C-alpha cells in the first residue's frame, strides 16, 4: 500500500510557513518517481541522498513538511541558510538528509485584492532550532517597556501577511514547498522505495 504523497502535494490549502504542517509517513511503499519525473517543480534539491536512487532506498520514518513562502525565499529552505525564513519560521539542520521540492502557485494562492491568508513571523528575539515550530502570537517587545498584550510603539504583532498579488514579480509570488526528511534510525525500516518491497 502506497505512501500518501497526493494528500501532501495536492492539498487544497497549504499552511503558513510559521505554522508549517508536518505529516508523518510510515508503514508504506513510496514511489518517488512521480516526483522527480514531473517537470512541474521548479526546485527539486536533495541533500545526503541522490534522486534517481530513492526508489531503491528504505527509511525508518519520513516526514513531509509543507508551507507557503514567496519565490525568492525558496533558497532559504536549505541547510545552512540565513534570513527571515530560516531564522524565524522554518529551519533545516546542517546535517539535513532529504529533499526540498517547490513550485509556483500564483494561480492558486494569489488574490485580485491581494491574498492575506498566508503569514510569516517577522519579529523574534532569537533564531529557531532546526525543525522548531513557533506559533506564538505574543506582542513583540522591541524596547524596555512591557506591552501587556497591547499593540503600540515598540510593541509589534510578530506575524505579517505576504499579500500575494498575481502581478507580483516572480520572486515575490507564492511558492508551495514540501520538505521530505529521511529518518534512518536504530529500528526497522517501515518506508521503502518500490524496488525494495
Amino acid at each position, epitope marked *: 500500500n502506497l505512501c500518501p504523497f497526493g494528500e501532501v502535494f495536492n492539498a487544497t490549502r497549504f499552511a503558513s510557513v510559521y505554522a508549517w504542517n508536518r505529516k508523518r509517513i510510515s508503514n508504506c511503499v513510496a514511489d518517488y518517481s512521480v516526483l522527480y519525473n514531473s517537470a512541474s517543480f521548479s526546485t527539486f534539491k536533495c541533500y545526503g541522498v541522490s534522486p534517481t536512487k530513492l526508489n531503491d532506498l528504505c527509511f525508518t520514518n519520513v516526514y513531509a513538511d509543507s508551507f507557503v513562502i514567496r519565490g*525568492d*525565499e525558496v533558497r532559504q529552505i536549505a541547510p545552512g541558510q*540565513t*534570513g*527571515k525564513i530560516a*531564522d*524565524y519560521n522554518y529551519k533545516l539542520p546542517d546535517d539535513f538528509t532529504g529533499c526540498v521540492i517547490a513550485w509556483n502557485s500564483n494561480n492558486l494562492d494569489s488574490k485580485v485584492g*491581494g491574498n492575506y491568508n498566508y503569514l*510569516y513571523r*517577522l*519579529f*523574534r*528575539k*532569537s*533564531n529557531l532550532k532546526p525543525f522548531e515550530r513557533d506559533i506564538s502570537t505574543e506582542i513583540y*517587545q*522591541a*524596547g*524596555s517597556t512591557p506591552c501587556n498584550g497591547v499593540e503600540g*510603539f*515598540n510593541c*509589534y504583532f510578530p506575524l*505579517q501577511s505576504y*499579500g*500575494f*498579488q498575481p*502581478t*507580483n*514579480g516572480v*520572486g*515575490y509570488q507564492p511558492y508551495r514547498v514540501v520538505v521530505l526528511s529521511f529518518e534512518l534510525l536504530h529500528a526497522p525500516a517501515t518506508v521503502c522505495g518500490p524496488k525494495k518491497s
Partner: antibody
Amino acid sequence: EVQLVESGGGLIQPGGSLRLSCAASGFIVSRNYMNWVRQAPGKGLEWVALIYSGGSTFYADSVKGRFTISRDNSKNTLYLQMNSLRAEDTAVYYCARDLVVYGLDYWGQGTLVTVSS
Amino acid sequence: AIQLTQSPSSLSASVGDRVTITCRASQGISSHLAWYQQKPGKAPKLLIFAASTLQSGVPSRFSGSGSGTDFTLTISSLQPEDFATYYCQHLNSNPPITFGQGTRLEIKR
C-alpha cells in the same frame, strides 16, 4: 527620548580602517533589526548593512568582505567596522532602526567619512 | 533586481499648491513602499509606509497611494517648510533594500 547618536567618522587614508558606533536609547538594539545607510556628498541613499536581532548579518555587494556590522548589548550600541576603505566609500553614514515592513523610523544624525590622501 | 525610478527629478511649486511625485518599480512589489523626506543637513524622515499609511506625527497633508509598480506621494496644500528631497524605498522583508534616486522639491514664490 528615542535617539541614536553616531560617532567615529573622520578622515582616513585609502586602504585604512575606521569603526563607527551608534549609541541608542528608547529601544534595545539587540532586539531590533538595525541598518547602516550611507549618502555620498550630493548623491542618493545607499543601503550598507543589516543585522537581525537573532544575529544574522547582510551586506550590500559594494562593501561585502570589507565591512562588518556588530553590536554590544550592555552598551546598547551598534557598530560598523570598515576595512580597506576606498575613495568611493566617502559619505555620511547613518544608523537606523528597521521595522522592516513599517520602514526606517529612527535614524542617527549622521557622521561623515572622508577617505583621502 | 528591483530598481526604483522617481519622476520628475526636480520640481517647483507655490505654497498652497498640490504636488505629486511618482515612483516606478521595475517589478511588481505590492504596497511594500515607503516615502521619506530629507531636509539639508538632516537624516531622512519617514512619512509613509506600506504605500499609504501615514507615519505617526507626520502632517495630514502628506498622502500616498499605488500598488504594484506605480506609486505616488502627494502633498495636498504645499507649505514653505516642505522644501526637501523626497525618497521612495522598497520595503523588502528580505535584505536587499533599495531607494529611489530622490526628487528635489523647491518652493516657488
